[PDB]
C-alpha cells in the first residue's frame, strides 16, 4: 500500500524534473536519458525506509483536527514527496561518499562513480544535481503551502547538518592538533582519537540526523502537527536510534558477507573509525592494542583477519548485545514519554524503532 | 568604502557560521580554526565582482525608481538594504566558491588565483574537499536563513537563488559530457574521447555557457539586487535576463582566450583548456571555419599534456585568425548589448545604470 503511492509519487516526480530540462534547460534527448538513468540507479534499489516513515508519522498523525478523504490524499501526496526529498538528499551524499570514500559496490551494484560511463568529475556533479533535485520538487510541490518556508529551513539545517557530520568522519584519523590544510596529513598510529565520545559525535550528525529526525519532523510538518509533540523526547530518540543504527552499521560491515551486505566491507582496510574500533581500544590490553595497531587500515591478507579475529577476542559481540539492551531499554522509556501526549506520534516512531532493531535481512 | 563594508560583512558571516558550529554542532577549536581556513581560501581572493554588483544594484534603486512607500529619503532603509546587499553577495560568492572547489577537483586543476586548488592542498585530502564544497553550498543556506530570517523576500530569494544554483549545476553537466558523442552515452557503458570532435559546435558551446557561466555570474546579482531593493517588478525581466545571458556569454568567450592565450602567471592558474581538450569558444570557432588538413592536424594535437603540441594546437588557432574572430564577435556584443540597455533606460533608468557598471567592468577586462 504506501510502496504503491511513493512509487506513483517517483514516478510523478521524476516526470516534472525530466520534463522541465527539456524545456527549459533547453536538454536534448540523450543528456535527459544519462539523467534519468543516474536517477533511478542512485535513487532506487533500497528498503526505503527514511522516505516510507514520513508517510506513516503523516498518516497516523491525520486526524488531530466526521471528515472528507481529501485532507488524507493532501497530506499524503505532500508526505510521499518530502519521503522523496530525503531519498534524494542521501542519494547525493551517498554518491558523494563512495567517491569520497573510494567504495566500489553499492547495493550489489557498483557504484554510481563507477559505472562503465560514468566518469568521476561527472559523478561529482551528478551528486550536486540529485540535492538541486530536492530543492526543485519541494518548490514545485510546496509552492503554496504555508508551511514551505519551515519545511525547507529545516531541511537545509538537516542537510548542513549532515555535511558536518562528513567533515567528523573524515577528519577522525588524524590529530586535530595537527590539522593545518598548509602541512601533510598523517594518519594517527595512536588512534587517540578513536574514542568512544568521538565515534558519538560523528554518528550523531552523519547519521542520526537524516536518518531519524528528519523523516519524523517533515512527517510532522505536513501534518500540521510538529508543535504537538515533544521536541526533546522526540530529539532523543532520533540520536538514540540513530546511534544504535550506525553501531549496527559498524558491525554489519566487519561481520556480513559481502555477498549478504552487498559491499565487500573496507572500514578495517581504510581504517575507519567504528564502534568495533573503538569499543575494542578501550577495553584491549597492552598487547592487544600493539597487535591491532599492526594489523589497522590495510588491505591484506592475514591483517583484517588479524583484526577481525582481535575483535572477537575482545569479545566485541557480547559488549554489541548489552550496547542493544540499554539503548533498547531507553528507547522505551522514551516512546512511552512520547505516548502521554502524542500516542499515535509515539506509535509511528515504534514502527520506526521495529524496523531499527531488529535490521537484519 | 563599499568593499569596506562588504568585508565587514564577512567578518560578521564567518563569526555566526564558526560560533554556530561550536556552540550547536559540538565542534572543537581545531576543526573550527581549519573551516576558518577553509572559507577564507575559497571565499577570499577574485574582486568580488557579482559579490559587489548586488550592493551597486541595490544603491542605484533606493536612488531612481525606489519605494515611495518608503519614508521621505532618510538614511535607515539604505543601510538596511546595503546590508543585505552585501549579505546577498556573500552568498552568490560563496555558492561560487563551491562550484569552484567540485570544478578544480572534477576538471583536476592544480591552481587558482595564484595558489593551489583547495584540493591541492597539502592537508586538504580529496575526500574532505569534496565534503567542504559541500559544506560551503551550506552555508549559503545558514547565512540566508541567519539575516533574512523576518525578510518578506526570503521565500522569493531562496527560490530563485536555488533555480540558479541548479541551473549552473546543470551546465557543468554539459561541459563534462562534451569531450564524448552524446549518442554514446549510457552509464553501463565505457566511453572514448570524441576524436572527430562533432560536438565541438557553436551552439552546444552557447549552451554549456550559458547554464553554467551566466546565470550565476550575470543574473543572481542583478536580481538579488533588484529582491532586496524590491524593486523586482518594476523591471522588463525578459530584457533583463536576456543581457545577462548576453554578458555572460562574452565573459566566457573572454575567458577562454585568456585561458589558452594569457600568461599563467597573469593568468593566476595554468590553462588547461588545451590539455583537457575543452570545449572553448576558440575550438568552435576554429573546427567551424578550418581546413580538412587544419582539422586533421588539430585532432593529432589537442588535449595532450605537453609543451608542443598544445603550442601547435596554438598555432592554428593563429593562422586561423581567429583573433579577428574574436574581434569581430566581441564588437556585434557591445552592440547589441549597448541596444539592451537603452530598451532598460526607459522604465528602469536607475537600473539600466547599475548595468552599465556592470558592463563596463566586463567588457574592460583584462583581469
Ligand atoms: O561512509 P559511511 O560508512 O558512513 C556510509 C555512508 N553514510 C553516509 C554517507 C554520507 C553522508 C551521511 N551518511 P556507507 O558507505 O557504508 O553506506
Ligand atoms: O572550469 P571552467 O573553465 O568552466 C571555470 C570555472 N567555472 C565554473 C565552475 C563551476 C560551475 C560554473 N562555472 P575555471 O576553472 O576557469 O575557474
Ligand atoms: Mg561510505
Ligand atoms: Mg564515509
Ligand atoms: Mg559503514
Ligand atoms: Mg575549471
Ligand atoms: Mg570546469
Ligand atoms: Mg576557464
Request: with cysteine; net charge negative.
Amino acid at each position: 500500500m504506501p510502496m504503491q503511492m511513493f512509487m506513483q509519487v517517483y514516478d510523478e516526480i521524476q516526470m516534472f524534473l525530466l520534463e522541465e530540462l527539456e524545456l527549459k534547460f533547453d536538454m536534448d534527448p540523450n543528456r535527459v536519458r544519462y539523467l534519468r538513468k543516474m536517477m533511478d540507479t542512485t535513487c532506487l534499489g533500497g528498503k526505503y525506509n527514511r522516505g516510507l516513515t514520513v508517510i506513516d508519522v503523516a498518516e497516523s498523525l491525520l486526524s488531530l483536527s466526521e471528515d472528507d478523504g481529501a485532507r488524507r490524499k493532501r497530506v499524503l501526496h505532500d508526505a510521499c514527496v518530502c519521503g522523496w526529498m530525503i531519498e534524494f538528499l542521501q542519494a547525493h551524499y551517498l554518491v558523494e561518499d563512495d567517491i569520497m570514500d573510494n567504495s566500489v559496490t553499492r547495493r550489489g551494484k557498483p557504484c554510481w562513480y563507477r559505472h562503465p560511463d560514468v566518469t568521476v568529475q561527472c559523478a561529482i556533479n551528478d551528486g550536486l544535481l540529485l540535492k538541486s533535485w530536492t530543492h526543485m520538487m519541494a518548490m514545485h510541490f510546496f509552492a503554496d503551502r504555508p508551511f514551505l518556508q519551515d519545511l525547507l529551513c529545516r531541511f537545509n539545517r538537516v542537510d548542513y547538518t549532515t555535511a558536518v557530520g562528513q567533515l567528523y568522519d573524515v577528519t577522525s584519523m588524524f590529530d586535530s592538533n595537527k590539522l593545518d590544510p598548509d602541512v601533510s596529513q598523517p594518519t594517527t598510529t595512536d588512534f587517540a582519537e578513536f574514542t568512544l565520545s568521538n565515534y558519538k559525535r560523528i554518528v550523531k550528525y552523519k547519521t542520526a540526523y537524516y536518518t531519524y529526525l528528519l523523516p519524523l519532523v517533515m512527517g510532522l510538518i505536513v501534518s500540521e502537527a510538529l508543535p504537538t509533540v515533544d521536541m526533546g523526547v522526540t530529539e532523543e530518540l532520533a540520536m538514540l536510534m540513530g546511534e544504535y543504527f550506525q553501531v549496527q552499521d559498524d558491525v554489519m560491515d566487519c561481520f556480513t558477507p559481502p555477498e549478504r551486505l552487498g559491499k565487500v566491507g573496507t572500514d578495517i582496510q581504510d581504517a575507519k573509525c567504528s564502534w568495533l574500533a573503538v569499543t575494542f581500544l578501550a577495553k584491549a590490553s597492552s598487547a592487544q592494542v600493539a597487535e591491532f595497531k599492526a594489523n589497522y587500515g590495510s588491505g591484506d591478507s592475514e591483517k583484517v583477519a588479524t583484526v577481525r579475529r582481535l575483535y572477537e577476542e575482545a569479545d566485541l559481540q557480547g559488549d554489541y548485545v548489552a550496547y542493544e539492551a540499554a539503548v533498547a531499554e531507553q528507547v522505551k522509556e522514551l516512546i512511552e514519554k512520547l505516548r502521554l501526549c502524542s500516542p499515535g506520534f509515539a506509535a509511528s516512531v515504534e514502527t520506526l524503532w521495529g524496523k531499527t532493531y531488529k535490521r537484519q535481512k
